[PDB]
Amino acid sequence: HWGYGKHNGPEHWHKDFPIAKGERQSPVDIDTHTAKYDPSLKPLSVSYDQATSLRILNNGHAFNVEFDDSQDKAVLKGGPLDGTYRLIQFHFHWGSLDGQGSEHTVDKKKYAAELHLVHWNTKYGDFGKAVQQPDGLAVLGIFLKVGSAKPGLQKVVDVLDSIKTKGKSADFTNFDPRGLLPESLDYWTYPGSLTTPPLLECVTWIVLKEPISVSSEQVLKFRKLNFNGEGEPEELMVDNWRPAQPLKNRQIKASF
Numbered sequence: 001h002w003g004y005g006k007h008n009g010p011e012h013w014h015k016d017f018p019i020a021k022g023e024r025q026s027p028v029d030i031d032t033h034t035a036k037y038d039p040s041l042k043p044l045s046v047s048y049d050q051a052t053s054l055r056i057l058n059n060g061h062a063f064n065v066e067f068d069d070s071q072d073k074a075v076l077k078g079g080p081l082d083g084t085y086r087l088i089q090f091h092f093h094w095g096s097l098d099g100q101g102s103e104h105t106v107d108k109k110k111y112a113a114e115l116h117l118v119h120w121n122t123k124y125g126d127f128g129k130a131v132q133q134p135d136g137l138a139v140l141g142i143f144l145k146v147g148s149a150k151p152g153l154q155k156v157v158d159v160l161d162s163i164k165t166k167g168k169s170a171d172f173t174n175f176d177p178r179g180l181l182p183e184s185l186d187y188w189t190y191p192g193s194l195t196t197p198p199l200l201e202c203v204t205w206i207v208l209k210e211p212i213s214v215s216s217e218q219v220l221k222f223r224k225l226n227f228n229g230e231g232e233p234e235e236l237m238v239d240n241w242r243p244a245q246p247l248k249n250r251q252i253k254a255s256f
């Protein structure tokens with residue numbers, strides 16, 4: 001099935017998922033000089049105080065930190081969004097080297113990694129129904145650079161040992177996603193898609209301008225994870241990013 005290797009990677013995906021060459025695919029390059037400040041954007045509201053994490057899962061592509069979404073507890077609203085979007089999970093994309101790893105790029109600059117916090121529109125009852133809608137999802141994207149350690153990431157880093165291979169999960173309750181955010185919520189926004197198959201075009205993207213910094217040894221442990229399942233030959237989980245896709249005269253708006 002789909003992956004990131006030579007034979008199952010990003011430009012193989014279109015065969016099972018034709019929407020890969022669609023009109024609103026993600027990620028994209030953010031050309032800072034082409035992005036326009038948008039006055040009609042309301043303030044962005046990230047409310048993660050009541051967030052209820054449950055478990056961490058190696059799903060063979062990345063690792064997901066999953067949340068209880070059966071009540072309004074961790075919600076994104078405002079900015080380009082209408083209504084309320086509930087946090088369901090977060091995950092990262094990263095590289096084999098510090099000079100690559102992010103999915104979005106800024107004036108063609110690649111960051112060492114990218115975090116995705118995934119939320120679904122409550123008017124649709126659940127995630128499965130929301131991903132059938134043009135405004136079903138909202139993803140908050142955050143860039144990672146190598147420098148100083150990110151304290152609020154270490155609990156994730158420390159548990160990666162327990163989920164080294166595909167299908168492994170561990171209890172991961174009481175994780176606070178607020179410790180992953182940069183200071184500024186200045187962002188770019190554009191309509192787009194999931195960046196993994198089925199690549200559904202249901203996402204309002206909100207990509208923060210300010211990167212978070214993580215330590216060399218934090219990213220190194222991401223790179224010790226496995227794409228393979230237990231008892232299989234070791235395939236290091238690295239370079240699990242899709243490259244930038246055609247903008248196709250969508251407009252990228254700046255909040256700033």
Ligand SMILES: NS(=O)(=O)c1cc([C@@]2(O)NC(=O)c3ccccc32)ccc1Cl
Pocket residue numbers: 059064116117118137139193194195196197198203
């Ligand atoms: N990379 S991503 O943030 O666009 C994203 C990835 C996923 C996914 O790769 N992570 C999953 O666990 C999953 C399950 C079914 C389909 C797709 C996925 C889900 C939603 C989103 Cl918004």
Ligand SMILES: [Hg+2]
Pocket residue numbers: 131132133134135136200201202203
């Ligand atoms: Hg959709």
Ligand SMILES: [Zn+2]
Pocket residue numbers: 091092093116195
């Ligand atoms: Zn993602």
